[PDB]
């Protein structure tokens, strides 16, 4: 059994752990060996992880996902997000379902100061937007990264 890998809009802003800035994934095309923020599901802590490659799978239909806090991203229907019950494709998600947001951001204060590295935010809407070039990252090990301040699954590498 092979799962099908997802992709996100080129406008998605990727958080660079070392640089501390956010760059659209389209600008990282062809780049490698740079650091991103990813969640370790076991420890549930945010770690710095290296990207092995950035690639484009062409023009595909993307959907806009919005959360209660206003986090937004455009992704293919098969792209996976982190829920309480594990990774779920965009077309598997239900309204009011919680997805993982990083608490650590490129700011002085954490996400929810008033009250361990993840904030669970409900989905308010998923809407079909249109067709545009979509990209993904390969993150050996953790296999996820922060895009538009949302935890998103990285490329699904299929050795076999």
Author numbering: -6 to -1, 1 to 109, 116 to 160
What does the paper say about this structure?
Inteins are protein elements that remove themselves from their precursor proteins in an autocatalytic pathway called protein splicing. In the first step of the canonical class 1 inteins, the scissile peptide bond upstream of the intein rearranges in an N–S (or N–O) acyl shift involving the cysteine (or serine) side chain as the first amino acid of the intein (residue 1) and the upstream flanking amino acid of the N-extein (residue (–1)). The M86 mutant of the Ssp DnaB intein (here referred to as WT intein) was selected by sequential directed evolution for its more general activity and is one of the few known intein mutants with improved extein promiscuity.
The M86 mutant was previously selected by sequential directed evolution from the parent Ssp DnaB intein23 as a more general protein splicing catalyst with regard to the flanking amino acids, a highly desirable trait when choosing a ligation site. Importantly, whereas the WT intein showed no or only very little activity with residues larger than Ala, the M86 mutant was able to splice efficiently with all tested amino acids, both in cis and in trans. In summary, we have further investigated the high sequence promiscuity of the M86 intein and reported its crystal structure. Notably, the structures of the WT intein and of M86 as well as of its mutants are overall highly similar (RMSD = 0.6 Å), suggesting that the differences in the splicing activity must be rooted in subtle structural alterations that can only be identified after careful analysis of local geometric parameters. When the WT and M86 intein are compared, slight changes of the backbone φ-, ψ- and ω-angles are observed at the N-terminal splice junction, which may correlate with the altered activity of the M86 mutant. The carbonyl group of the scissile peptide bond is slightly shifted between the two structures, a finding that is also reflected by differences in the ω-angle. This angle is closer to 180° of the perfect trans conformation for the M86 intein.
